[PDB]
């Protein structure tokens, strides 16, 4: 059962129960692309915040009756309270401006406002979608404003806290293991010693530089397009609208949003989305290396490296009974792979602005929100289910430490490089110890070898 | 309300009405990454087919009783018939083998078989998840089989016919517009004439080459890992299982699946996924250009090219009243940018196999199906709501054709490049016509100009 | 010292001894971007062939006098014999059509033909760069023609032989190692057995599939734009020129070139470059894996896996004396990482056609030829200096084989998954053997265990 | 001709007159991959600065005699004055550590030092390449140090100044065209007016945001690995060496380099190269969009947009006489396509560290330096030959603007969206002005229309 709704193109049958109208219904039917309602909820939420703000600003500046503000406000509160989730059926793969999702908001607010005020759904709303709910706005400044609200919110409320969480565990493990001496590997080959603490201090430092790099991008990301309207000029905005609607968004979200310095840059590009996503990819490449190291170190438990123990959360294998695998490592490496591809998509799209508008907005927003959410989720999963539980396998570490022929490196400043190399080659060829061959070649006394080749004194300077 | 299921790690509380067991539930709780149940339904379907196939093969080779085959068979039928979708809650971002989704089928199939046979959830299944439903199988060979079944089925039944549909529209437009003489543009600058039909024949040709590139990758994609089990060796497989189970998958799917030539290549790599997705990315880069040319050609009405007219499907703009946008073009360019990204992800994951197993299966699987589906969807949408409706802007085409100073190129073989170059530069600097300056420079008679410079004669 | 050359835009000081003229000199001065003369020689060599074929076709079809054909052929023969390599100073980062490089061929051929014929540099050439050397031609068809010649030549003469050679070594090793039983690793954890032969047969299969995938893309790539001229219409070409010039190029190169089926596709895209480079990229990603497995398999010699011994070609380390690294594996992984980003560049540029011409020709050409050359060079280097010399570390393989608790998988069909899991978990927890704990649990007798748990019998069907 | 040099692996025939030794010759022969001597000159230069710094630090802390420092500094001073370019024959695609290039420096410094001291090639060098030139160093800390010196130097001396120079032209253009009203385009369709100045202000803003994003990465980039040695522990360094060698590098370069906070991160990753290249790729995608806009705006000159005039630097076309193309825009869009690809390679290699060492150092070095150099060179080129000469085509701007039906947007706040859409659709169907139809539909008076619809007032707020 459908009712008739109208736009400036003609009449459309709209499902009789739904708060949306003609332009929403056209979009729902004209873009059967991927799964239904794929436009991210975070973008709808951000729309709820900015549409409330536009109404509060427009009232303060004298161009919208308080009555209309109050009704738009209450409708926006209901969107924000996840009361109207089923009134947003549009996909990412629509018009590249997000005009159709902007009109999905305008139409649902107008009709929901009509019913709140005691009207019948289907009757001309007391609130006009374009003239009232969209007053002083474009899809061109609202959709970018929704993008930066959702993006900033997800980065500062989910992603950075989740990455800080893992960073703190890695630094905690660096201190916890500060006295466990293990063998270095370079090129996958036996190297000189370092503590398991030092190894983990690398991982902790990678995420600290990652957090800094993301934080460096937030000033650009907090700038909002709202007030540039169609082409950036602020056509049909009241004087002072730009600064005042930003203040309202800042106050509703509790986050430090300002009006964009340049509305042309803010419509014609998503450079801020590229800058922040670049930082998300940097952390993601770091996380890949960290998770890869942890699975290498935990490999075995008999025929691999086996230097660390990790929590055993589930049966690893349907055919190999008793197998346990590093599954959180794998989930982390898979997300990191996802973020690299998302970075290609965002980078490509970010180049493809024409004149006064970039019309890759939905695809940039969906890819950015996915990276930001998945990095958050997997950092929490990995910390809870792997990183907090990492412990050293003491005897395996000792066996692999005492084994390295490259312990010989401690004799470099005593007998020089060429003589140290003779010892290592000779031990290697003969299947003997460094100590045996240092003595046999008469290059070092038993005494001096035992004084000089001490792993625990090789993990700092002279 | 929960009930106790057991795995070889101990007891787990399971939602008492759900057909899954200990291992599904651990995964559901341990992998809270992205939206719930993100594992593609195409993979769950692929699993329905191969789990049925496994059971039928195992009974044929003497290692599974018929009674147990029929119960597994029935449960798989219900999975294919979309009766058990709520029984599959696991995410892409699980173990990189897909072990947890393989154990999701094994556990669901076993418990549902018990109930089909007259049992109750909460009792020991007459069918063992591992010894019976997972007989002669590993996560390592079933999950890549699922991947190829799903990938091959999406490409031949959805992606190719959608691309074929748009290709024939573009060829039909190339013939319909064969007599429409328009100006060519190179470097975005005015050039020599071609027909609109000729321009459209380039787009038609692009998707025909793209259709061949995709078809070339099908022989590798049609090959299935099933029979390699743990490491590629076929450990715990009966002799002849590899070929027999491929035949049942072929039969059940109606599609030409064969056993993989090398089960070690089939487990350690997803080079078939990289091969076929490179071809989807080729088609996507073509589609981007076509979609971009079409919105360039339709740009205006005043401030652009405006050489074609496109269907006007919806109001373009919440603030600019009456504006109409090439919105199907923009959906097609946004899909193409997604697929390029999906190619970076798949290529990177494809490189990261270790020893006997590539454990990036689900992210490669998810990114593949997304590219295949969205290319399918956007080609149908674009054909329906744009390509089928394109028509020339007849007066606009003639105005822009007759205005090109690079019509002077017709004079090359008569007066040489240098003399031709003087006519076009004098016309441009004086804001006059080629003809007026050919006469004022004394390089061409009026009568020779009119004979030699005929746009219709410059299109071959 | 300079001389004056002229183009349609005015007078230019040209280095007095060089055979290029005004347009080549303008491009050399106006595009100071990266190293001088970066335009690949393979593109100049392709231009040498197609310029000769164009002169020959033009005379056969009555529009170029034989005398001018002969002088052009001789200048073109000098370019192909590498006698004029210093006459091409233009960069990749010029006009997106490669117009400047086409005019570099036209100017050099014209001025060289003039001197061959007895004239001097500084005089007006008896052969006009545009009217004669460029007759029946555009940059828009010559440059893509140069790209396909250079690419197809490089793929069939260098890339495919290189990969075939390494494929054959890997097939040989598969046969040589067919009876060497080693432990499989899944998720990096101890799995069930396979032969070192089986593992290597995987590597051999990956490169056969990759060769098939490159070869599938050749039919598209052997199609030449030559004949489309300015926009694809073949304006200013005599009837039959497209087929005739393709035949001369087939003959001069000895490679199966044909005229493009659609000259609009041949000018407005380089989808054939995108098609073939995606196959090169497929191969690069397979090579990454093979190279990474081999260094993983060689790791140690005590702290790693160390199942294979590889050729030791040089000292590994300036500070760690006697260290030897898998350096060929590293070159292969680094090239694979280069090819993936080359594919990002080619795809992006692939999408960015406008109307009748794609003007990213040089960046596509350079990235393609680099990938094809590097893949060939590293497969040859890796075959000679690593793959040919790989041998098993037999005793290390035996140790790592016998220590795997997942040998218990052989018991699945005898006692079940749950009973087999009990044995492996008990062995793990106790630091004991499968065999001990199989007897200890009354699950399996000595005799049956010794019968059923045979690694040599776990590398095939039941 | 040859002489014998020796390494810990044996005797090598070295070209008699070359200052390199056994390890450089091995590498030269063992890695025949891509053109000869591909390792960037900037990496060798960086090595020059750091080897001299190491020698001075080593003397100050009493572990190298002043006499040996003086010789190392003299050989280092010959590398830095570009006198020994022919002594560095090694390729990018070597060992993934850059070991062979580290030993190339050590060998050439040793032997050139020996000859400077009055010795002869073929003699044992007075200075040992491992014990003296490489004292208190690994390849694992010197190669990353070379990379950061090279990367930091290139970005702040070439890339930032080039980008700043172009930004300043786009800002001067924004101010020069502040009063020129032109038609907006959104989705490539007629939109509302903005000034040509406001449009250029977007371009200027993009480069300003890009410059800030690049500078935010400099703090991480100026950290040097030097002092970490083999695995990061500073094994075989004297106390204070890390800090003191950083001061010498800062002194000799004149740039504020500091010792890395975490030497394990400085060896096991190139996260700082990922961080800075991300910012470079941001600026490239911005430059792509700017260059594409300028070529769209300049297109025609009679059957495109044609709103702006760009300088005419060369004949555009070999067949179409008098054609002139936007060739500098093309060079910039191709470089941008190159940098995006470079970002993929760098991101991939950045993820692929194992344990204590990332062994993709050369490929990350080469791709970084290419991006930084090409972005500098094309920004200077585009500025000099394109952007400084951009002028309005005033009559053509007015022609395309006065036309626009979306000037109707000025009526929204007076009559509402639905009435404004009637006017626009009726003018469109009838091919009449907005004014005629506004009056004729009885929706707006002549007086009110002329008052409310003023293009010049549509470039700002109500």
PDB file of C-alpha atoms in Angstrom, chain A residues 183 185-192 295-296 298-305 317-326 330 344 348 351-352 400 403 405-406 408-409 412 417 420-421 424 428 432, chain C residues 185-192 295-296 298-305 317-321 323-326 330 348 351-352 400 403-406 408-409 412 417 420-421 424 427-428 431-432:
ATOM      1  CA  UNK A 183      68.124 -13.456  20.184  1.00  0.00           C
ATOM      2  CA  UNK A 185      66.756 -11.797  13.952  1.00  0.00           C
ATOM      3  CA  UNK A 186      67.634  -9.596  10.905  1.00  0.00           C
ATOM      4  CA  UNK A 187      66.785 -10.888   7.362  1.00  0.00           C
ATOM      5  CA  UNK A 188      65.151 -13.811   9.361  1.00  0.00           C
ATOM      6  CA  UNK A 189      68.744 -14.887  10.249  1.00  0.00           C
ATOM      7  CA  UNK A 190      70.263 -15.321  13.763  1.00  0.00           C
ATOM      8  CA  UNK A 191      71.535 -11.889  14.999  1.00  0.00           C
ATOM      9  CA  UNK A 192      72.703 -10.329  18.355  1.00  0.00           C
ATOM     10  CA  UNK A 295      52.361 -14.826  15.273  1.00  0.00           C
ATOM     11  CA  UNK A 296      55.996 -15.540  14.109  1.00  0.00           C
ATOM     12  CA  UNK A 298      54.336 -17.659  18.889  1.00  0.00           C
ATOM     13  CA  UNK A 299      54.711 -20.193  15.987  1.00  0.00           C
ATOM     14  CA  UNK A 300      55.002 -23.962  16.775  1.00  0.00           C
ATOM     15  CA  UNK A 301      54.477 -25.012  19.431  1.00  0.00           C
ATOM     16  CA  UNK A 302      57.288 -27.551  18.617  1.00  0.00           C
ATOM     17  CA  UNK A 303      58.533 -26.944  14.969  1.00  0.00           C
ATOM     18  CA  UNK A 304      58.551 -23.082  14.781  1.00  0.00           C
ATOM     19  CA  UNK A 305      60.059 -20.159  16.819  1.00  0.00           C
ATOM     20  CA  UNK A 317      41.454 -26.608  13.231  1.00  0.00           C
ATOM     21  CA  UNK A 318      38.525 -28.866  12.098  1.00  0.00           C
ATOM     22  CA  UNK A 319      40.905 -31.746  11.018  1.00  0.00           C
ATOM     23  CA  UNK A 320      44.105 -31.294  13.145  1.00  0.00           C
ATOM     24  CA  UNK A 321      42.881 -32.099  16.702  1.00  0.00           C
ATOM     25  CA  UNK A 322      44.389 -29.872  19.473  1.00  0.00           C
ATOM     26  CA  UNK A 323      45.790 -27.264  17.029  1.00  0.00           C
ATOM     27  CA  UNK A 324      45.628 -23.639  18.343  1.00  0.00           C
ATOM     28  CA  UNK A 325      46.290 -20.765  15.857  1.00  0.00           C
ATOM     29  CA  UNK A 326      47.017 -17.015  16.323  1.00  0.00           C
ATOM     30  CA  UNK A 330      45.066 -12.962  11.494  1.00  0.00           C
ATOM     31  CA  UNK A 344      43.669   3.575  -2.609  1.00  0.00           C
ATOM     32  CA  UNK A 348      41.750   8.021  -6.128  1.00  0.00           C
ATOM     33  CA  UNK A 351      41.843  13.551  -6.862  1.00  0.00           C
ATOM     34  CA  UNK A 352      38.588  13.438  -8.904  1.00  0.00           C
ATOM     35  CA  UNK A 400      67.635 -19.896  20.893  1.00  0.00           C
ATOM     36  CA  UNK A 403      72.615 -20.972  19.923  1.00  0.00           C
ATOM     37  CA  UNK A 405      76.813 -17.877  16.249  1.00  0.00           C
ATOM     38  CA  UNK A 406      76.446 -14.030  15.852  1.00  0.00           C
ATOM     39  CA  UNK A 408      80.658 -13.582  18.127  1.00  0.00           C
ATOM     40  CA  UNK A 409      79.917  -9.839  17.394  1.00  0.00           C
ATOM     41  CA  UNK A 412      84.616  -7.050  17.132  1.00  0.00           C
ATOM     42  CA  UNK A 417      85.928  -8.098  12.194  1.00  0.00           C
ATOM     43  CA  UNK A 420      85.602 -12.680  14.660  1.00  0.00           C
ATOM     44  CA  UNK A 421      84.412 -13.943  11.193  1.00  0.00           C
ATOM     45  CA  UNK A 424      81.888 -17.940  13.306  1.00  0.00           C
ATOM     46  CA  UNK A 428      79.489 -23.059  11.470  1.00  0.00           C
ATOM     47  CA  UNK A 432      80.903 -26.597  17.118  1.00  0.00           C
TER      48      UNK A 432
ATOM     49  CA  UNK C 185      52.824 -25.250   8.559  1.00  0.00           C
ATOM     50  CA  UNK C 186      49.323 -23.618   8.513  1.00  0.00           C
ATOM     51  CA  UNK C 187      48.816 -20.281  10.396  1.00  0.00           C
ATOM     52  CA  UNK C 188      52.647 -20.717  10.968  1.00  0.00           C
ATOM     53  CA  UNK C 189      51.768 -23.605  13.412  1.00  0.00           C
ATOM     54  CA  UNK C 190      52.923 -27.287  13.168  1.00  0.00           C
ATOM     55  CA  UNK C 191      50.585 -29.137  10.772  1.00  0.00           C
ATOM     56  CA  UNK C 192      50.721 -32.570   8.991  1.00  0.00           C
ATOM     57  CA  UNK C 295      63.819 -17.154   3.140  1.00  0.00           C
ATOM     58  CA  UNK C 296      61.418 -18.483   5.857  1.00  0.00           C
ATOM     59  CA  UNK C 298      66.292 -20.985   5.024  1.00  0.00           C
ATOM     60  CA  UNK C 299      65.976 -18.885   8.278  1.00  0.00           C
ATOM     61  CA  UNK C 300      68.493 -19.582  11.113  1.00  0.00           C
ATOM     62  CA  UNK C 301      70.867 -21.263  10.946  1.00  0.00           C
ATOM     63  CA  UNK C 302      69.851 -22.113  14.637  1.00  0.00           C
ATOM     64  CA  UNK C 303      67.062 -19.581  15.652  1.00  0.00           C
ATOM     65  CA  UNK C 304      64.750 -20.135  12.631  1.00  0.00           C
ATOM     66  CA  UNK C 305      63.223 -22.981  10.568  1.00  0.00           C
ATOM     67  CA  UNK C 317      76.504  -8.072   7.458  1.00  0.00           C
ATOM     68  CA  UNK C 318      79.057  -5.220   8.102  1.00  0.00           C
ATOM     69  CA  UNK C 319      78.916  -5.735  11.940  1.00  0.00           C
ATOM     70  CA  UNK C 320      77.822  -9.415  12.387  1.00  0.00           C
ATOM     71  CA  UNK C 321      80.842 -11.425  11.113  1.00  0.00           C
ATOM     72  CA  UNK C 323      76.357 -13.808   8.805  1.00  0.00           C
ATOM     73  CA  UNK C 324      74.820 -14.761   5.401  1.00  0.00           C
ATOM     74  CA  UNK C 325      71.380 -13.463   4.313  1.00  0.00           C
ATOM     75  CA  UNK C 326      68.810 -14.562   1.690  1.00  0.00           C
ATOM     76  CA  UNK C 330      64.931  -9.754  -0.694  1.00  0.00           C
ATOM     77  CA  UNK C 348      44.436   5.110 -12.073  1.00  0.00           C
ATOM     78  CA  UNK C 351      40.619   5.345 -15.860  1.00  0.00           C
ATOM     79  CA  UNK C 352      41.569   9.000 -16.752  1.00  0.00           C
ATOM     80  CA  UNK C 400      60.959 -30.682  12.778  1.00  0.00           C
ATOM     81  CA  UNK C 403      58.284 -33.144  16.796  1.00  0.00           C
ATOM     82  CA  UNK C 404      54.818 -32.104  15.312  1.00  0.00           C
ATOM     83  CA  UNK C 405      51.959 -33.152  17.642  1.00  0.00           C
ATOM     84  CA  UNK C 406      49.670 -32.758  14.553  1.00  0.00           C
ATOM     85  CA  UNK C 408      48.044 -37.253  15.460  1.00  0.00           C
ATOM     86  CA  UNK C 409      45.729 -36.292  12.482  1.00  0.00           C
ATOM     87  CA  UNK C 412      41.158 -39.242  13.029  1.00  0.00           C
ATOM     88  CA  UNK C 417      38.713 -36.109  16.431  1.00  0.00           C
ATOM     89  CA  UNK C 420      42.957 -37.633  18.846  1.00  0.00           C
ATOM     90  CA  UNK C 421      42.614 -34.124  20.421  1.00  0.00           C
ATOM     91  CA  UNK C 424      47.852 -34.215  21.436  1.00  0.00           C
ATOM     92  CA  UNK C 427      51.438 -34.698  24.988  1.00  0.00           C
ATOM     93  CA  UNK C 428      51.515 -30.815  24.908  1.00  0.00           C
ATOM     94  CA  UNK C 431      56.029 -32.167  27.357  1.00  0.00           C
ATOM     95  CA  UNK C 432      55.883 -35.854  26.168  1.00  0.00           C
TER      96      UNK C 432
END
